[PDB]
Design an enzyme around this catalytic site. Sequence first.
Site, PDB file in Angstrom:
ATOM      1  N   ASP A  88      14.236   2.378  -5.340  1.00 43.00           N
ATOM      2  CA  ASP A  88      14.902   2.390  -6.637  1.00 43.00           C
ATOM      3  C   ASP A  88      16.374   2.773  -6.449  1.00 43.00           C
ATOM      4  OD1 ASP A  88      14.894   5.214  -6.317  1.00 43.00           O
ATOM      5  OD2 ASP A  88      13.133   5.470  -7.560  1.00 43.00           O
ATOM      6  N   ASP A 265       4.721   0.056 -10.001  1.00 43.28           N
ATOM      7  CA  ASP A 265       4.719   1.294  -9.223  1.00 43.28           C
ATOM      8  C   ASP A 265       4.373   2.441 -10.157  1.00 43.28           C
ATOM      9  OD1 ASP A 265       7.757   1.226 -10.178  1.00 43.28           O
ATOM     10  OD2 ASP A 265       7.268   3.313  -9.745  1.00 43.28           O
ATOM     11  N   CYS A 303     -16.607   1.237  -5.858  1.00 45.68           N
ATOM     12  CA  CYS A 303     -15.374   1.285  -5.075  1.00 45.68           C
ATOM     13  C   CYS A 303     -15.662   1.092  -3.585  1.00 45.68           C
ATOM     14  CB  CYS A 303     -14.683   2.638  -5.310  1.00 45.68           C
ATOM     15  SG  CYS A 303     -13.175   2.840  -4.330  1.00 45.68           S
ATOM     16  N   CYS A 305     -13.590   1.882  -1.146  1.00 46.78           N
ATOM     17  CA  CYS A 305     -12.711   2.661  -0.272  1.00 46.78           C
ATOM     18  C   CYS A 305     -13.496   3.511   0.737  1.00 46.78           C
ATOM     19  CB  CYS A 305     -11.754   3.561  -1.083  1.00 46.78           C
ATOM     20  SG  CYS A 305     -12.362   5.187  -1.589  1.00 46.78           S
ATOM     21  N   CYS A 308     -15.364   6.524  -0.752  1.00 45.37           N
ATOM     22  CA  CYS A 308     -16.598   6.286  -1.484  1.00 45.37           C
ATOM     23  C   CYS A 308     -17.722   5.792  -0.580  1.00 45.37           C
ATOM     24  CB  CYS A 308     -16.350   5.296  -2.628  1.00 45.37           C
ATOM     25  SG  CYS A 308     -15.298   6.065  -3.944  1.00 45.37           S
ATOM     26  N   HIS A 334      -8.734   7.791  -2.488  1.00 48.02           N
ATOM     27  CA  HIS A 334      -9.573   6.998  -3.374  1.00 48.02           C
ATOM     28  C   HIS A 334      -8.755   6.368  -4.504  1.00 48.02           C
ATOM     29  CE1 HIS A 334     -12.386   5.767  -6.419  1.00 48.02           C
ATOM     30  NE2 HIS A 334     -11.685   6.530  -7.247  1.00 48.02           N
TER      31      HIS A 334
HETATM   32 ZN   LIG Z   1     -13.240   5.084  -3.707  1.00 46.30          ZN
END
Ligand SMILES: [Zn+2]
Lengths: 371, 371
Positions: A88, A265, A303, A305, A308, A334
Amino acid sequence: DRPRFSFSIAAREGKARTGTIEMKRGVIRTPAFMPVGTALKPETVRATGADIILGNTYHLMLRPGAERIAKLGGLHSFMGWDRPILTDSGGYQVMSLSLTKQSEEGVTFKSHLDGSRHMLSPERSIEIQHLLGSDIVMAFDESTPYPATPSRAASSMERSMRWAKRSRDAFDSRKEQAENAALFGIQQGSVFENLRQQSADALAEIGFDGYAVGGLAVGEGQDEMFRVLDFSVPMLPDDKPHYLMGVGKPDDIVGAVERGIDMFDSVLPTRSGRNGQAFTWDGPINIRNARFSEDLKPLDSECHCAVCQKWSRACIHALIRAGEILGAMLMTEHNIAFYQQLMQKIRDSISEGRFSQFAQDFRARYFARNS
Amino acid sequence: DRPRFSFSIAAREGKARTGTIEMKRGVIRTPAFMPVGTALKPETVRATGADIILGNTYHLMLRPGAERIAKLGGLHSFMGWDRPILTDSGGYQVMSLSLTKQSEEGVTFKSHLDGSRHMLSPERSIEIQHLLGSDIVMAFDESTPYPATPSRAASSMERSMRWAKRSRDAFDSRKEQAENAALFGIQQGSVFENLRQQSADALAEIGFDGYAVGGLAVGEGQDEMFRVLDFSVPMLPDDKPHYLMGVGKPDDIVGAVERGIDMFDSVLPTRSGRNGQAFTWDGPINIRNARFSEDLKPLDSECHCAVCQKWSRACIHALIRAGEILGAMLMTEHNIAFYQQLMQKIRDSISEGRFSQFAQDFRARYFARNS
Ligand SMILES: [Zn+2]
Ligand SMILES: O=S1(=O)CC[C@@H](O)C1
Ligand SMILES: O=S1(=O)CC[C@@H](O)C1
Ligand SMILES: O=S1(=O)CC[C@@H](O)C1
Ligand SMILES: O=S1(=O)CC[C@@H](O)C1
Ligand SMILES: [Zn+2]
């Protein structure tokens, strides 16, 4: 040989688009979410799916300073991130965190850390972003606090457009920057349609690689933000990326993509993770709540990820309640990964021509809060 | 004004005793378990119930050295532990870890770290333990590897008794040590009753503040260890503490108290904790076993330790499987605390005259392994 900046739209649905931005340091899949890099390890942030991260010029100026970062090899070396980085301009944090003097020339401000004096302007901002070595450079504009009078909205927008031309010329004056990075301009005009059109026309006359919608997510509420996006995004050039700065919650992102936004963002996934809040397809949850102390399910049972696949709500609850930093790290990983999976579902659903259905399905479940 | 060393027996049951050792740095409740201090924070070790910890002279000699520890203020300052500390003589680790020369004079050995030369003897061991500033000092003896021939057992025992007198005289030669610390002698003689009696008579003629049973827990098995304790402990002076060095598992401790032992040390709770093994009233468990991945009960459902008030088997399982150091720290804290709760139940049951029942109840449950 990778190009400097090439935006290709692969599929559309209404105002929504999905595609890619090719840059020398990598490909950015759009619609894109950029985590704010300015901690998790960079390899962890990359594994969540992020293609590009954001750096806050203002904070980097104050510590350790952009000249020091340049001597260390640039922001990519400093952050351990070798893919694209957007910076930015610094101007928003000047308004919100620091301010000795303001004029059409630029601004002088005092560091909220040590009181030192710093200066920003279109020319200085572009130069500092060059020292940082970022791949996408934001033009320096003037932010108007919310809510803004019609007079102050027009005044800041017209100054922002003069500063956008100065940003353009400063960027073009450095061959090393102009040949290797990209420059985005920022539309202003508050909630006023005529001012937004004025701004869009001026930016397109100057010419930029991408166009941001500025002046939103500053207290106005989602309905008003959506109403402004409804008429503001079509004013921007269709064949260039559209960037909604500082947005936002998952439902803000979905609605903004419905309205033509390609890039986002927000600090929200990282701030929420540090505060014990996880995003899920059934809405956000507060992991400290007693209902999670014996909940063996992961933060979100869909999820993908790494967190998880392994950790239960019960165990993250235990870590957060004990104040163990690992708890906050797992929540933050996460949340950033959840945001990236949201973007992937958005991209896939646009490609398949079922994004309008995905958005309705998403809202019905996210707001029912059956977590 | 606290005394140098005062052992008081408060209650007896058969050969078992419970009482206190009063020293200048604090009271030691007996039967006592001493964790090996040579990491958890010292305040954590104290909160588990430990009244005294053990330091390994040999390891402290090699790094950072006892002269350096003395310059730092002594072992209490070095370890952050202001209650009593017992130091061993160093002689056992010379046999088991290092050895240039051995004679009646003493031993010269090479550091397994950097090859440097070090020397131990009754006089040098007592002097080094004085530099460390420990509260209970062990006489320097000669260990005989297991199994030992009758000839080698008699040979090492007689040398150990000559070295015990030399240890006594060295300790008595330093007023600062003799007035403020205590000295224990070590009975030897392997499995041989006549040698054990020879050793006990020699030690009592010299005179010590406490008497250790050496030469056990070196491979002989529990039944043989118990048989040796059966005749060896009654040979020692009744009005002084009896210390079984390097023992041991919970059932070893219970059986040794049944046979007159007042003090114990073992690395087992800390080694097990680092290896993912927890002690419970239903026997040891391996927390990595899949059966614990969704077990919401604590490591032991009767254990009063801080870990078991908060953490489930499932979450410690998750931490250990991930290799997070917190997992090992929690297991180690639990194991040391479990050992202290075992000692407390032993003390209370002797006081109430129900220790024989407690020992039978303990064994039936510990060996059934209904965890
Ligand atoms: Zn997750
Ligand atoms: O956002 S990042 O990848 C993690 C912290 C920095 O290494 C940049
Ligand atoms: O190194 S800097 O970013 C440029 C000069 C100061 O504003 C600090
Ligand atoms: O056993 S201790 O109390 C913990 C590690 C050292 O501070 C001595
Ligand atoms: O400082 S020390 O413990 C005594 C001399 C060496 O054995 C090292
Ligand atoms: Zn416990």
